[PDB]
Amino acid sequence: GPLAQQIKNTLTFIGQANAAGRMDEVRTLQENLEPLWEEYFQQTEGSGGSPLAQQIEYGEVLIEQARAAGRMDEVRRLSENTLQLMKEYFQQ
């Protein structure tokens, strides 16, 4: 419950930062969202998790691999897609 609420709040803050033209904050919010989702995924979904949860989880892995390679344009594209899936998962 509390962890889901923190993820939902983070999605709201990303929306607000985006609407304010504050993409420097969207970068930070996306980075802090990843470990919250990771914890949520490993505790409530995991290997037996729903296909949507697995798609979001692997999407975050692809984002992190793109970030490690410096492909921040790919981070942004993948982040936009994975955020839409998270909004479906959390009904946000």
Coordinates of C-alpha atoms in Angstrom, one line a residue:
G1 CA 0.0 0.0 0.0
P2 CA 2.5 2.7 1.1
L3 CA 5.0 1.8 -1.6
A4 CA 2.3 1.8 -4.3
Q5 CA 1.2 5.2 -3.0
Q6 CA 4.8 6.5 -3.2
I7 CA 5.1 5.2 -6.9
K8 CA 1.7 6.8 -7.8
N9 CA 2.9 10.1 -6.1
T10 CA 6.1 9.9 -8.2
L11 CA 4.1 9.5 -11.4
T12 CA 2.0 12.6 -10.4
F13 CA 5.2 14.6 -9.7
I14 CA 6.6 13.6 -13.1
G15 CA 3.4 14.8 -14.7
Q16 CA 3.6 18.1 -12.8
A17 CA 7.3 18.6 -13.6
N18 CA 6.6 17.8 -17.3
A19 CA 3.7 20.3 -17.4
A20 CA 6.1 22.9 -15.8
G21 CA 8.8 22.3 -18.5
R22 CA 11.1 21.0 -15.8
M23 CA 12.8 18.0 -17.6
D24 CA 15.8 18.4 -15.2
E25 CA 13.4 17.2 -12.4
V26 CA 11.8 14.5 -14.6
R27 CA 15.4 13.0 -15.0
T28 CA 15.8 12.8 -11.2
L29 CA 12.2 11.6 -10.6
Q30 CA 12.7 8.8 -13.2
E31 CA 16.0 7.8 -11.5
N32 CA 14.3 7.6 -8.0
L33 CA 11.2 5.8 -9.5
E34 CA 13.3 2.9 -10.7
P35 CA 14.3 1.5 -7.3
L36 CA 10.7 2.0 -5.9
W37 CA 9.3 0.0 -8.8
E38 CA 12.1 -2.6 -8.5
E39 CA 11.2 -3.1 -4.7
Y40 CA 7.5 -3.3 -5.6
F41 CA 8.1 -5.7 -8.5
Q42 CA 10.4 -8.1 -6.5
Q43 CA 8.0 -8.1 -3.4
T44 CA 4.5 -8.4 -5.2
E45 CA 5.1 -9.7 -8.8
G46 CA 8.5 -11.4 -9.4
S47 CA 9.1 -14.3 -11.8
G48 CA 5.4 -15.3 -11.4
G49 CA 4.2 -11.7 -12.0
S50 CA 1.7 -10.4 -14.5
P51 CA 2.9 -9.9 -18.1
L52 CA 2.4 -6.0 -17.6
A53 CA 4.6 -6.1 -14.5
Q54 CA 7.3 -8.1 -16.4
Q55 CA 7.1 -5.6 -19.3
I56 CA 7.5 -2.6 -17.0
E57 CA 10.4 -4.3 -15.1
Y58 CA 12.3 -5.3 -18.3
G59 CA 11.6 -1.8 -19.7
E60 CA 13.4 -0.3 -16.6
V61 CA 16.3 -2.7 -17.2
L62 CA 16.5 -1.4 -20.9
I63 CA 16.4 2.2 -19.5
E64 CA 19.2 1.5 -17.1
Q65 CA 21.4 -0.2 -19.8
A66 CA 20.8 2.8 -22.1
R67 CA 21.7 5.2 -19.2
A68 CA 25.0 3.2 -18.5
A69 CA 25.9 3.6 -22.3
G70 CA 25.1 7.3 -22.1
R71 CA 22.2 6.9 -24.7
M72 CA 20.0 9.5 -22.9
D73 CA 17.8 10.0 -26.0
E74 CA 16.9 6.3 -25.7
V75 CA 16.4 6.7 -21.9
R76 CA 13.9 9.4 -22.7
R77 CA 12.0 7.3 -25.4
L78 CA 11.9 4.2 -23.2
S79 CA 11.0 6.2 -20.1
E80 CA 7.9 7.7 -21.9
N81 CA 6.8 4.1 -22.9
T82 CA 7.4 2.5 -19.5
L83 CA 5.7 5.5 -17.7
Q84 CA 2.6 4.9 -19.8
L85 CA 2.6 1.2 -18.8
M86 CA 3.1 2.1 -15.1
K87 CA 0.1 4.5 -15.4
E88 CA -1.9 1.5 -16.7
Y89 CA -0.6 -0.7 -13.8
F90 CA -1.3 1.9 -11.1
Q91 CA -4.5 3.3 -12.7
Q92 CA -2.9 6.8 -12.4

